[PDB]
């Protein structure tokens, strides 16, 4: 019985930007969520359709591990039924989401003096994302009636903005690493247990 490779996902040295969020398929293995839930490091640990403490008792067919960085005050948008810049344009959970949302402050790793500009998010889009849809396009967003022709200006915005994380930011603006675990139960052997 091989252990769940949660280390590659939670302990990845770098995380994706939320607009290009990473997905890892987790199956085979059999790891325990008690230590994760009893960990003093995760500031958010919220589950839907399933109980975190009783996770060791349950078996599922597949697990998806999505990971990315957002700012602290956006963690509340990583939940079913939310709207806002992140839920609308970057990473959208379904209403019937079954899984857990885990986040922790990553200021020590992801902020730099003068700003870490590596992490981006999408501010504009012609429509809201469908659940688990991904958009990595970079066309100038034409908000107004003037064509942009690839240049910013009159109501013409580059769609991605850098978080520019600085260590002196308040915790609402500090970077948080997020792991979304989707517990899928289809018609297959339940190979992932606690």
């Amino acid at each position, epitope marked *: 019985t091989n252990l769940c490779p949660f280390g590659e996902v939670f302990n990845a040295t770098r995380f994706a*930007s939320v*607009y*290009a969020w990473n997905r890892k398929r987790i199956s085979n293995c059999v790891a325990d969520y008690s230590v994760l839930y009893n960990s003093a490091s995760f500031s958010t640990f919220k589950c839907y359709g399933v109980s975190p403490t009783k996770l060791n008792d349950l078996c599922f067919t597949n697990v998806y591990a999505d990971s990315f960085v957002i700012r602290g005050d956006e963690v509340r948008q990583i939940a079913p039924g939310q709207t806002g810049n992140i839920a609308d344009y970057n990473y959208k959970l379904p209403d019937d989401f079954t899984g857990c949302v885990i986040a922790w402050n990553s200021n020590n790793l992801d902020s*730099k003096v*003068g*700003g*870490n*500009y590596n992490y*981006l998010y999408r501010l504009f889009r012609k429509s809201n994302l469908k659940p688990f849809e991904r958009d*990595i396009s*970079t066309e100038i967003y034409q908000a107004g009636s*003037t*064509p942009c*022709n*690839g*240049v*910013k*200006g009159f109501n013409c915005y*580059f769609p*991605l*903005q*850098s978080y*520019g994380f600085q260590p002196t930011y308040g915790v609402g603006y500090q970077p948080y690493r997020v792991v979304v675990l989707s517990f899928e139960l289809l018609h297959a052997p339940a190979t992932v247990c606690g």
Partner: antibody
Amino acid sequence: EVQLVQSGAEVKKPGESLKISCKGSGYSFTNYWIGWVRQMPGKGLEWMGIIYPGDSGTRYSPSFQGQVTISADKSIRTAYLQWSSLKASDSAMYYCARSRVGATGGYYDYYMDVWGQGTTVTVSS
Amino acid sequence: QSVLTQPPSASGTPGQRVTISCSGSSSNLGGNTVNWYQQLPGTAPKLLIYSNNQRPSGVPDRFSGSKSGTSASLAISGLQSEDEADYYCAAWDDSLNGPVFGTGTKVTVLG
């Protein structure tokens, strides 16, 4: 190859109007922004503005908005920079340049890949 | 915060390596890539580096650019006499809604 050819040197007095030109060759003139850059003698480069000849849209630097007019005539592949009333302080070298735009790794790209040979403007009373 | 600051001058002997800094802010380099232009005396500027570190055809690999956050740098390895020129960094700036050129650096190949 892609080429920009500008008009000849200009000697003017303050108060006269002036229109200098920049003709493009070897590319689709209506598919690229073309812009103007000022270089006063001994000094650095200053971006003035751009026009998209496909639809005549313009973007002007705030330092040059309303001081000059940029235009284009796509039937003859030519862009223009115009003053209604020159000052001595308009004395400078002026370049036109073709813009290239896009994005790399989520960050905005804008650069000037083909340059005209420059037009000297000398204004004195 | 909308000026790209460059050292006024730089110099080296032939074969040496010279580096030219380009200092910006969140409104330009933070969300936009940097470019470099080379102007030999009496000539028009030419594109030297685009999008932080790409070289057009006809620019040798002795020129390399780099960008980290709000800072950028041009390195010239194995200085040759024809490299004596003014160098300008540049990027789009979102406060002004337009491209801005750096203040320029004069490079001398010590003869």
